[PDB]
Design a protein around this ligand. Structure first.
Ligand SMILES: CC(C)C[C@@]1(C)NC(=N)N(Cc2cccc(Cl)c2)C1=O
Length: 387
């Protein structure tokens, strides 16, 4: 591990997001910021909010610059654009001038108890609001310093419920800015092409549930796109793929019947402490386009990744979970519960995303997550969707 200063710099969990500490302004104002690979704006609470115990105060920053322009983002948050000096305490030892959307109004954006006060959109300018002229933070970072155009994320799910006090004292993972820390993964890194630079778009070419081919036209797996998004909790799948996957996961786990509410990701299921039947649930393998023609590799996750630990409505001693795979009308989204099984390298410089088994993924004595290759796969270009 060559990036000790950035190792263990994240806190949080899949359901509320993972955040890194940042400072904005002069003198520096400390804020917790959601790491989001699914958006492209650096936006921070800049006014009183019931769920914020701190916010960016522009009038207190001598380096604050007003852009005299508003920004509206309906998902919703509304803000005022400006620039100011930004640093990441547990990151590269550099300070950069970056765009900052000062959030003055929001609805269902700030999560009570998440402990984050802003969001760091790490994707490309193409999806930045109001438009692509608003340079994303990471672009500014790379243009203004010698930091390599690459970052890597190790998101660490605990494998169990973290109460309010625990989630604040627990290490939630690592965001390595400008490099790859070898202590964060085991085995080899396998790279899949970033199909296009907007979201971190990838192409899935095959899906297996316990080794059984879901057998769908691979274009279905990427309809209308597949992205890697730390800002989403669940593994989200295109409606038709979701229906086929749930049918297969139910069949694999058929020795136990679960209520429709469970499969809809709305209700928790509980087992007596320590008796969660991990073994009756299937592993899920996603094959991704490789860097070599006609070559693919696969990432395999366990139910320890797709069943999200949640506290029992009775706070009892049972181990309870929610099914963290859900339907999407906007394509496949490899959310936080999937990222928790792997060390994910966002190699912007080489337009590729790398995957390796995470040193912090949750597993049991019988099965582990995996990243394996190579596999001979034909016509993978046909798996991509074109509007
Ligand atoms: C982290 C959230 C609160 C804020 C935001 C913008 N970031 C994010 N990754 N998503 C999920 C998403 C991805 C792609 C399209 C849409 Cl519409 C939403 C969001 O809604």
């Amino acid at each position: 591990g060559s990036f000790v200063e950035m190792v263990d710099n994240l806190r949080g969990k899949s359901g509320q997001g993972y955040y890194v500490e940042m400072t904005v302004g002069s003198p520096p104002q400390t804020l917790n910021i959601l790491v989001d690979t699914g958006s492209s704006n650096f936006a921070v609470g800049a006014a009183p909010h019931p769920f914020l115990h701190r916010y960016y105060q522009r009038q207190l920053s001598s380096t604050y610059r007003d852009l005299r322009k508003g920004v509206y983002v309906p998902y919703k948050w509304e803000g005022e654009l400006g620039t100011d000096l930004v640093s990441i305490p547990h990151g590269p030892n550099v300070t950069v001038r970056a765009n900052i959307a000062a959030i003055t109004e929001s609805d269902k954006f700030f999560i009570n108890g998440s402990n984050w006060e802003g969001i760091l959109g790490l994707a490309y300018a193409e999806i930045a609001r109001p438009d692509d002229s608003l340079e994303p933070f990471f672009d500014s970072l790379v243009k203004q310093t010698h930091v390599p155009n690459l970052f890597s994320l190790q998101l660490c799910g605990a494998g169990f419920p973290l109460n309010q006090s625990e989630v604040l004292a627990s290490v939630g993972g690592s965001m390595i800015i400008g490099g790859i820390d070898h202590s964060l993964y085991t085995g080899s890194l396998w790279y899949t092409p970033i199909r296009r630079e907007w979201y971190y778009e990838v192409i899935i070419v095959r899906v297996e549930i316990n080794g059984q081919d879901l057998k769908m036209d691979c274009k279905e797996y990427n309809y209308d796109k597949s992205i890697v998004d730390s800002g989403t909790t669940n593994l989200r799948l295109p409606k038709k793929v979701f229906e086929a996957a749930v049918k297969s996961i139910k069949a694999a786990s058929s020795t136990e019947k679960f209520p429709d509410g469970f499969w809809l990701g709305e209700q928790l299921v509980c087992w007596q402490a320590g008796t969660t039947p991990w073994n009756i649930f299937p592993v899920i393998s996603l094959y991704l386009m490789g860097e070599v023609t006609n070559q693919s590799f696969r990432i395999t996750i366990l139910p320890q990744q797709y069943l999200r630990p949640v506290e029992d409505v009775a706070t009892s001693q049972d181990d309870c979970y929610k099914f963290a795979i859900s339907q999407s009308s906007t394509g496949t989204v490899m959310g936080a519960v999937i990222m928790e099984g792997f060390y994910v390298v966002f190699d912007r410089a080489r337009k590729r995303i790398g995957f390796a088994v995470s040193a912090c993924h949750v597993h049991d004595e019988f099965r582990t997550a995996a990243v394996e290759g190579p596999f001979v796969t034909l016509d993978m270009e046909d798996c991509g969707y074109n509007i």
